[PDB]
Amino acid sequence: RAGPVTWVMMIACVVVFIAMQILGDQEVMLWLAWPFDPTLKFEFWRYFTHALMHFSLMHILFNLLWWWYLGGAVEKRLGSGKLIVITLISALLSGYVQQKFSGPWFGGLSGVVYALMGYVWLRGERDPQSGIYLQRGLIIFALIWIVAGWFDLFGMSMANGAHIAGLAVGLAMAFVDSL
Numbered sequence: 001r002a003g004p005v006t007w008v009m010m011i012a013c014v015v016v017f018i019a020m021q022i023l024g025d026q027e028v029m030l031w032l033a034w035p036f037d038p039t040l041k042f043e044f045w046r047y048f049t050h051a052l053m054h055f056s057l058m059h060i061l062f063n064l065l066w067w068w069y070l071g072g073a074v075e076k077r078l079g080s081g082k083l084i085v086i087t088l089i090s091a092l093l094s095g096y097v098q099q100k101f102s103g104p105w106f107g108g109l110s111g112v113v114y115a116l117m118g119y120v121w122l123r124g125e126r127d128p129q130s131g132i133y134l135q136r137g138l139i140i141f142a143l144i145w146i147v148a149g150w151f152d153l154f155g156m157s158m159a160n161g162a163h164i165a166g167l168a169v170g171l172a173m174a175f176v177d178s179l
């Protein structure tokens, strides 16, 4: 069974997605988006809660599938705290990069997913004895997912910088952990 962090993130993402359909996207953003006014700067949740908002059925579905699988394996084999820190750092840095080039109106677990991909793969590669690795088939489907994003496939128009930021964090932490 999926652990407490894997579970609560999925719940939170569904609750927020529901809230977005009922109230509208823009209204949910006013509460959860990255600070878009200087007066909102000390509302600390906003540097993270942008990761809980999704705009498309397809990104929430696939973001949560990857989260469920990679997050779940990290949680079970390496503990809940590990998953928390990976999420918080990747959300913060991917958010930071995104807002820098495209402004404060954005959201999604896309960045956090890149970080779990990076983490799980590089950790399996460098430190087999940890128990976690990214299976061959999944490397392939991860790469297709990455490629679909990079080249704007399937009518998608996302920013690459934030995704790079997320992957960098996952690699960095995998590097640190395999010493």
Ligand SMILES: *C(=O)c1cc(N)ccc1[C@@H](*)C(=O)OCCc1ccccc1
Pocket (backbone or CB within 6 Å): 058, 059, 060, 061, 062, 063, 108, 109, 110, 111, 145, 146, 147, 148, 149, 150, 154
């Ligand atoms: C982030 O949300 C993101 C990042 C990348 N690189 C690709 C997609 C997404 C969102 C997502 O999962 O969208 C669905 C893509 C998809 C999956 C399967 C078939 C067709 C399209």
Ligand SMILES: CCCCCCCCCO[C@@H]1O[C@H](CO)[C@@H](O)[C@H](O)[C@H]1O
Pocket (backbone or CB within 6 Å): 030, 031, 037, 040
């Ligand atoms: C560009 C010139 C005008 C700027 C207008 C920006 C107003 C700042 C909005 O603040 C936000 O208002 C929301 C509802 O209005 C609340 O949900 C939220 O708690 C609050 O933080």
Ligand SMILES: [Cl-]
Pocket (backbone or CB within 6 Å): 053, 054, 055, 056, 059, 060, 107, 108
């Ligand atoms: Cl989305």
